[PDB]
């Protein structure tokens, strides 16, 4: 449950040979990388708001 104001960027990695599960990695303003659950609609909402930004 990372707040929007702290998210700097989002990277979405699709399934591949090295990983069978979709990954969402959020890079925060403080430089720490966090993992997000793809199934959570909050991530999709965050992405939509960022795109509309």
């Amino acid at each position: 449950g990372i707040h929007l104001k702290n998210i700097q960027s989002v990277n979405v990695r699709s399934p591949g040979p090295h990983c069978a599960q979709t990954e969402v990695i959020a890079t925060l303003k403080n430089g720490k990388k966090a993992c997000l659950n793809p199934a959570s609609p909050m991530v999709q909402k965050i992405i939509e708001k960022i795109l509309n930004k």
Binding site: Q8, S9, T27, K29, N30, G31, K53
Partner: protein, 298 residues
């Protein structure tokens, strides 16, 4: 139009390795020169003329700038790994000392103009306000350096290592471009105009007299002006080119981006030489300082 694609950045090892050596050498020379100048000025209280105070303040500014150099060299090496507080403090100190150094050069030019062209008139007596003028210059530098303190932090990116950049919000790029006007106006154009005017009239009045040492003074003035130009003009021109490119006046391309980045770094290296060179151009080229330094060896 598949040609469009990200412009990957490129980094070299040779520049990293050589820049550290250059910065360390400049640090050593600047420290030694400023120490010598301060020692000479402070050791003896006789003959504490206005130029002595001006040179003392210039030496202090250069000493602080050199003291701040090594952290900047480390940052150039590996990127700003040193947190936010140090980014703010060091950027503040660097910019304050740079502005004060430039404005002190301008003030010394004004003093020479008052003391030569207007030697016979009643205006020259206004050159005994070194204390208040120097205080005003330092205060103006501190006022001008505020934006660095207010909007500087580390920026974490994927392509590039962390950098002690500015963070003004959504439209940070445009605001940074606007803030760049201050270093190029109160830092280059205004002092350049003042120096050119003062030294032009000084040369005009000197060339018409019959003094014995006129030629050496003319050569010294030419040397000072050329040193200032060579030290600062390249960096300012490259910065203006970068501003124009961001404004789309000049076509923008990845090759141009790399070229301008390299030019910015090289011109910053070159312009850092001013702190080391100032003691030689302004102070040690004088007879009084050399005689005093020779005396102090007792």
């Amino acid at each position: 139009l598949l040609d469009a694609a990200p412009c990957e950045p490129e980094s070299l090892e040779i520049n990293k390795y050589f820049v550290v050596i250059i910065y360390a050498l400049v640090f050593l020379l600047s420290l030694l020169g400023n120490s010598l100048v301060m020692l000479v000025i402070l050791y003896s209280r006789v003959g504490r003329s206005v130029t002595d105070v001006y040179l003392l303040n210039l030496a202090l500014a250069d000493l602080l700038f050199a003291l701040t150099l090594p952290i900047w060299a480390a940052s150039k090496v590996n990127g700003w790994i040193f947190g936010t507080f140090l980014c703010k403090v060091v950027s503040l100190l660097k910019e304050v000392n740079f502005y004060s150094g430039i404005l002190l050069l301008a003030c010394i030019s004004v003093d020479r103009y008052l003391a030569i062209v207007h030697a016979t008139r009643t205006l020259t007596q206004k050159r005994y306000l070194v204390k208040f003028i120097c205080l005003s210059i330092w205060g103006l530098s501190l006022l001008l350096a505020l934006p660095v303190l207010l909007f500087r932090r580390t920026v974490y990116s994927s392509n590039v290592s962390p950098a002690c950049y500015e963070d003004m919000g959504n439209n940070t790029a445009n605001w940074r471009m606007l803030l760049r006007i201050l270093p190029q106006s109160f830092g280059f154009i205004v002092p350049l105009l003042i120096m050119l005017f003062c030294y032009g009239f000084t040369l005009r009045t000197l060339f018409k007299a019959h003094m014995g040492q006129k030629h050496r003074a003319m050569r010294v003035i030419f040397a000072v002006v050329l040193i200032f130009l060579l030290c600062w003009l390249p960096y300012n021109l490259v910065l203006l080119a970068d501003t124009l490119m961001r404004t789309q006046v000049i076509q923008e391309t990845c090759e141009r981006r790399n070229h301008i980045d390299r030019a910015l770094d090289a011109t910053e290296i070159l312009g850092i030489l001013h702190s080391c060179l100032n003691p030689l151009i302004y102070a040690f080229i004088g007879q009084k300082f050399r005689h005093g330094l020779l005396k102090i060896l007792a």
